[PDB]
Structures are given as structure tokens and as C-alpha cells.
Enzyme design. Structure first.
Site, PDB file in Angstrom:
ATOM      1  N   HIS B  41       0.798  -1.218   0.000  1.00 23.82           N
ATOM      2  CA  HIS B  41       0.000   0.000   0.000  1.00 23.82           C
ATOM      3  C   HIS B  41       0.835   1.274   0.000  1.00 23.82           C
ATOM      4  O   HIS B  41       0.258   2.359  -0.063  1.00 23.82           O
ATOM      5  CB  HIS B  41      -1.043   0.000   1.132  1.00 23.82           C
ATOM      6  CG  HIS B  41      -0.510   0.067   2.533  1.00 23.82           C
ATOM      7  ND1 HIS B  41       0.199   1.137   3.021  1.00 23.82           N
ATOM      8  CD2 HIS B  41      -0.731  -0.746   3.594  1.00 23.82           C
ATOM      9  CE1 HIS B  41       0.434   0.956   4.318  1.00 23.82           C
ATOM     10  NE2 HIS B  41      -0.091  -0.196   4.682  1.00 23.82           N
ATOM     11  N   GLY B 143       3.034   6.211   9.382  1.00 20.89           N
ATOM     12  CA  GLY B 143       4.405   6.105   8.939  1.00 20.89           C
ATOM     13  C   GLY B 143       5.164   4.928   9.519  1.00 20.89           C
ATOM     14  O   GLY B 143       6.282   4.649   9.068  1.00 20.89           O
ATOM     15  N   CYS B 145       4.167   1.848   9.159  1.00 25.41           N
ATOM     16  CA  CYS B 145       3.990   0.669   8.324  1.00 25.41           C
ATOM     17  C   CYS B 145       5.318   0.221   7.734  1.00 25.41           C
ATOM     18  O   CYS B 145       6.193   1.038   7.424  1.00 25.41           O
ATOM     19  CB  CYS B 145       2.997   0.963   7.216  1.00 25.41           C
ATOM     20  SG  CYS B 145       1.309   1.268   7.835  1.00 25.41           S
TER      21      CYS B 145
END
Ligand SMILES: Clc1cccc(Cl)c1N=C1NCCN1
Ligand SMILES: Clc1cccc(Cl)c1N=C1NCCN1
Lengths: 306, 306
Positions: B41, B143, B145
Site C-alpha cells: 500500500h 508512517g 507501516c
């Protein structure tokens, strides 16, 4: 979202851990530039530890008696001295992995990370707090002595603790990196007992703010209080007195959440008086006091290192 | 003595963390040999995340659109592919800091350490468990991830989790390093809710053994039970059923302490039925289930790394 007992990343300290052996005894040392720091009781035997005369025991030691090993590699010891309760072993090679660093003596209530090591090898990392009675509640087995506590600010490791002793009650005592013990403790196997383990009130308040920021808010109430009224209750529950210094340092969390410091104090007061009635706050059933205001901001912000 | 929620030393993983930017979005990637792994993503905008067609969004991307930065140094992307919910970005330089490593898919109840990162930079480390509903209870902000979960065995990092999603209830979901989500979760911003967060019974039992090893023993009683009787109570309290596999893995802690597994089950049963009455076990007011039997042995033994 989420709030966790979080240690600093430990790599920078991992690159400084070595094994120190003197005679029969092996513990950990900290290799920074061309000096290795370790507990002076490395020179003692188990018997020596009832009443050691370190200065006399040291007379029998020469550089070549301190075996210092970094991974599989032996360091050459070219000098040694005692500074309070630590030895400084000068080696002929500067640690190429030395981070930027400082030695700090922390105050009770301040938190730090510990890298538990055995035989110079890292085993795990966890977050601790210097208790108001100057113990820490750690996880240390035989051979963990010389493991260190530290904080990191951007790219600079501030070392604040070196582990030395387990008290008969299972709590832990140690020094700063100049070798001065925190609290009244000494490096002798004697009758030393910890005083009252009071709760770090400013940290509990910080953690309650953290809880509100994350959706745990059932403990918020309709009340407020005053510093003096709150401290009457704190004293009764063996909580550290809250000062205006403390209020001021909670200011930023007050501003972010819109909850006045004294309103939060009134929530804490009710929790102290009525318990939690089987409920939880941030996954805990008791009031956590090992997160400082700076910790809460840091983790609720996402500050990073190096 | 002492027992602490302990993470693995994080240095080996710290040397693998990089920043990945695609367009407007920046998260973390994992650099192992000449491949960088990150959540697919990264290629989505905030709007895209209601109903993304990753295969179509990827058509618009070329190697030069994935900006990969290791510290202050840019890596050259020479290929890219999607594997389930992760991207694999091939770079022209192998990470010189690659540790020995493996990719593992863990089972619910297994524990692991998480290195929380932002912009490719480590912020903190903490210990987590894969819940029986296949969420984890982490600490992740925007942030984070691409932060990873891992275990270390001697000198080998077994990566088991990559962080992807926060559910509307504040729990977290992610994938293994082949990009398959744990549980039923998907990388879309949709209605996905976690099932029942059952308690990991074998871990609670392990932690009770840890407590006895450290002097917390008030909860030991005169009783015993059977697997079937205990599980009648476990079910009522949304505890995972205890199996003979589970009993067997508690064998070594049984042997060290002299407390039969089923006698410990009877202690746990009474704690479930009568609560703790305001007492604590290893500093907790609730029954901790994020320590595996192996964890307890490991920490009560002093096993080290590399
Ligand atoms: Cl930077 C410094 C300060 C004091 C003593 C030495 Cl030997 C120093 N040199 C190095 N430390 C890390 C690698 N070189
Ligand atoms: Cl060891 C290996 C396995 C697969 C691909 C590459 Cl490029 C490798 N080479 C290196 N990895 C770490 C430093 N060199």
C-alpha cells in the site's frame, strides 16, 4: 495508536558490550573509545564479597590479569584504574563502533532502557525506572553484572546505569558510569534493604494522559482538586508529592488533550480511593508509573534515532 | 532474579531498516541482501485505500518511482514485483549488514519483538504476541507501516511480521514476509473487525511458573484438576482450550519447579474464579499471557545472541 512499554533501539549499545574475566569471575564491560568500564567486583571471589577491601585486592592485579574479549577478539589491556565502584581498563584499540555518547546521573523517577547481557553477549532489552528508593526492578541473573542502562536522544547515547548488585528482596542496585551507586547501596554482600517503594506520581499522570490520547477515558470524572489536597491523598497512598515543577512538565500533555493537570489529578485521586473495580487502563489493572512525560510525548509523536 | 517483558536486542534488524517513498507516501522497508520488502500500500494514496486495485495501480509504477533511502544513502532500484500484500524491490547493492535470517509464519500465541520505525529510522522496541484473533496489540503511528516483528535464535533473525493496518478498534494487523496477512484482514480501509480476544492459556501458565521461580507464590493452592475440568472453566473465561501438546511443552518448567502442570492449572482456575483480591503477581494485577514457555525458560536461564 496503542501504547507500549518501549525500549530504545539497542544496536548502538550492543556494539559496545564485551566480556571481562578476572580470575574465576566473568561479567560484562562497556567498551567506549579505548576504555572498558566494568564493576570493580569482577576482582572478587564469591567469598571476598562479605567484606572486600578493593584497594588491597587490586594491588594483586596487573593489566594482563583482566581478560577482555569483544566477540571472538581479544583486546590488549594497557592500563587500569579504579574510579569509585567501577574499573576503567585502558585497551590499545578504540572501539570502532563507539557511538556518540555521554555519561549522565539520573534522578529518581527517570526511565531508561537496559540491555541485559551475559558473557559480553546481549540477551534482551527492556525499559526500567530508577525507583524513588534508588533501586530498579530489573531482570538480572548471575553474570549480568556490567549490563548498562541508557537513553538515546537523536544520535547520542546517554549512559546512566551499570548493574552491580541484587538485594535479598530481588530488586537491583547499581552505579552511574562514574561508579557512584544510586542510593545508599554498596558493593558488599551485606544487610542492605530498600526503603519504601513510593509511586512516581508525575509518571502515573503522564500515563493517564497517554490513555486518554488512545481512547481509554472511563476514569475521567467531573472533579478537580488542588495541589495540596491531592498531595494529602498521595501521601496516604505512598505516592511521591506532586510539585509545581511536575505540573509544568505535564503542560504539553495538558495542552494536547485539553485536560487540565489538576482535573487529571482528581481522576487519579478517585482511582486511588476507589480502585479500578476490575477495569483496565491501557491493558493494565494497576496504575503504571514507569513512563515519564517525555516518554509519553515521544511515543505519542514518533520521534526516531540517528 | 526479576522477570521483565523483554525484547530481543534489535541491532541486527536496525541495520536492515530503510525508508521507501512512492509518490506522496513514505513508510519503512526491510533491506535483506539485494531486496527491499515493504507493504504494497505504499503505492496508494489515502483516497485509494477504500477500494484499491493493486495490480492496476502498479501498472503506473516503474523502478524509478520507488525511492529507497538507507540512512542518507540512496539505493538504486533495478526491479520490482508484488508478492501477495508485499512489494519486493530489487536494488543493485546487497545490504552489507544483512544478518543470518529466515522468514517464518508464526502461530497465534507465539511472541515476537517489534522494532517500531518512522522514515526508515528506529524509534523503539517492544515485545508483542500474535493474538488468537490474529491481531497484535502494538504501538504504531502513521508512517510506522513496514516495521517488522522478529525472533532471534543464536545468530539468526526469524522475521515473522510486517506491519500494515490499524483497525478502527486500535489493534493492528499485518503480514508475514511473504505478504500473507495474519488472520482474515485485508489491506483496504473497510469494515473489518477483530474476533474475540481470547487469552493464551499456555502462556499464562508459563508466566505463573516464572512467578514461582522468583518468589511470588501466594497463588499456589492445595488443589489439582484435570484437563477437561480446567477447560470447562477456561471456556467460560474465554481462555484458549489447553491441550496435551500444551502440557508437554510446560514439562521443563514443571520439572524445574516441582509443580505439576495440572496443579498449576488448579491455581489458575482459582485465580479465574476468585480474582486476585487486590494482590499482584510479578508486578501485574492481571494474568499476563504474552510470555511463551520458551520465553520463560530463556529469560530464567540467560540465553544470549550471536
Ligand atoms: Cl574519539 C576518541 C576519544 C577518546 C579516545 C579515543 Cl581512542 C578516541 N578514538 C576512537 N574512538 C572510536 C574510534 N576511534
Ligand atoms: Cl548472501 C546473498 C544472498 C542473496 C542475494 C545476495 Cl545479493 C547476497 N549477497 C549479500 N548479502 C549481504 C551482503 N552480500
Amino acid at each position: 495508536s496503542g501504547f507500549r512499554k518501549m525500549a530504545f533501539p539497542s544496536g548502538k549499545v550492543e556494539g559496545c558490550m564485551v566480556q571481562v574475566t578476572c580470575g574465576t569471575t566473568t561479567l560484562n564491560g562497556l567498551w567506549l573509545d579505548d576504555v572498558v568500564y566494568c564493576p570493580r567486583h569482577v576482582i572478587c571471589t564469591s567469598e571476598d564479597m562479605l567484606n572486600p577491601n578493593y584497594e588491597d585486592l587490586l594491588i594483586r592485579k596487573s593489566n594482563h590479569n583482566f581478560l577482555v574479549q569483544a566477540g571472538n577478539v581479544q583486546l590488549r589491556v594497557i592500563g587500569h584504574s579504579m574510579q569509585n565502584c567501577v574499573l576503567k581498563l585502558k585497551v590499545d584499540t578504540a572501539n570502532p563502533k563507539t557511538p556518540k555518547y555521554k555519561f549522565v546521573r539520573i534522578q529518581p523517577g527517570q526511565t531508561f532502557s537496559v540491555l541485559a547481557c551475559y558473557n559480553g553477549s546481549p540477551s534482551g532489552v527492556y525499559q526500567c525506572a530508577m525507583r524513588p528508593n534508588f533501586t530498579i526492578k530489573g531482570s538480572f541473573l548471575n553474570g549480568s553484572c556490567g549490563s548498562v542502562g541508557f537513553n538515546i536522544d537523536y544520535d547520542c547515547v546517554s549512559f546512566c546505569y551499570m548493574h552491580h548488585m541484587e538485594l535479598p528482596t530481588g530488586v537491583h542496585a547499581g552505579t552511574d558510569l562514574e561508579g557512584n551507586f544510586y542510593g545508599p547501596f554498596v558493593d558488599r554482600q551485606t544487610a542492605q534493604a530498600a526503603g519504601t517503594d513510593t509511586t512516581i506520581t508525575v509518571n502515573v499522570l503522564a500515563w493517564l494522559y497517554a490513555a486518554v490520547i488512545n481512547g481509554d477515558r472511563w476514569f475521567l470524572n467531573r472533579f478537580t482538586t488542588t495541589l495540596n489536597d491531592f498531595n494529602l491523598v498521595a501521601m496516604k497512598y505512598n505516592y511521591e508529592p506532586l510539585t509545581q515543577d511536575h505540573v509544568d512538565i505535564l503542560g504539553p500533555l495538558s495542552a494536547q488533550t485539553g485536560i487540565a493537570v489538576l482535573d487529571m489529578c482528581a481522576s487519579l485521586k478517585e482511582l486511588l480511593q476507589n480502585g479500578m473495580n476490575g477495569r483496565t487502563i491501557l491493558g493494565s489493572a494497576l496504575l503504571e508509573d514507569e513512563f515519564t512525560p517525555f516518554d509519553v510525548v515521544r511515543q505519542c509523536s514518533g520521534v526516531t534515532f540517528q
